[PDB]
Amino acid sequence: TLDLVNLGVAANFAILSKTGITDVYKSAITGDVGASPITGCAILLKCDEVTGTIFSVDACGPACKITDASRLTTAVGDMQIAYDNAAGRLNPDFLNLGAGTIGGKTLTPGLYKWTSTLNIPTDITISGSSTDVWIFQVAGNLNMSSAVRITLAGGAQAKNIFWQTAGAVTLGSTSHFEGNILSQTGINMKTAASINGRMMAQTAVTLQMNTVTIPQ
């Protein structure tokens, strides 16, 4: 029933930011990474940290980098269209579920909105079919605590989950996240946190020894 958020060319990236990608070595990224319009030197990943292509707007950046301004321009533009599309969905199924703390919940499909910061202090399940869609609209920050795991149940797929945040995302140390993040600012991961999803930030993505896998 709820339509997918079309990511266009941004679908090809595990990490896409506008002001760079910082990293505490070593991270494990599966899929392409990019930043635009910032210089490629703002991508602080080593070549042995990415399975995929590192894209740069210029001659600057990691040894393996491909320079491709035009593809990054399209990807970032596509990321902004996706952000606006996700932020623009009307008629939420839920508004202010758990008063902004959703620890222990099982989330069924649909459109969710929070006019605050969303916190996830304890494990949650996202439960639905291989074709169901979840859009989470968050007017503040999104926080997940250390060791918190998002579990998928019933055939729910990470590629059908979208998190739209007006504020910064903070994934706590050793936490496991599921879904696409469309952040208006930063996405900040802590020591050994993992994500099955895409990190699309209109500022920066920051990593500390993270595992990042594009959804299949």
Author numbering: 61 to 276
From the paper:
The mutation site for FfIBP_CC1 was located in the top loop of the capping head region, which contained a largely flexible residue Gly121. Among these mutants, only FfIBP_CC1 and FfIBP_CC4 formed disulfide bonds within the intended area. However, FfIBP_CC1 did not exhibit any significant difference. Moreover, MD simulations using the FfIBP_CC1 structure indicated that the disulfide bond formation between C101 and C120 stabilized the fluctuation of residues in the capping head region. Consistent with our hypothesis, FfIBP_CC1, which has an additional disulfide bond on the capping head region, exhibited increased thermal stability, with a melting temperature (Tm) of 65 °C compared with wildtype FfIBP (60 °C). The TH activity of FfIBP_CC1 was akin to that of wild-type FfIBP at equivalent concentrations. The data indicated that FfIBP_CC1 significantly inhibited the growth of ice crystals, even at a low concentration of 0.4 µM, which is comparable to that of wildtype FfIBP. In addition, FfIBP_CC1 exhibited increased thermal stability, even when exposed to high concentrations of chemical denaturants such as DMSO, MeOH, Urea, propylene glycol, EtOH, and glycerol. Interestingly, unlike wildtype, FfIBP_CC1 underwent a two-step denaturation. Furthermore, the incorporation of disulfide bonds into the capping head region of FfIBP enhances its stability and resistance to thermal and chemical denaturation.
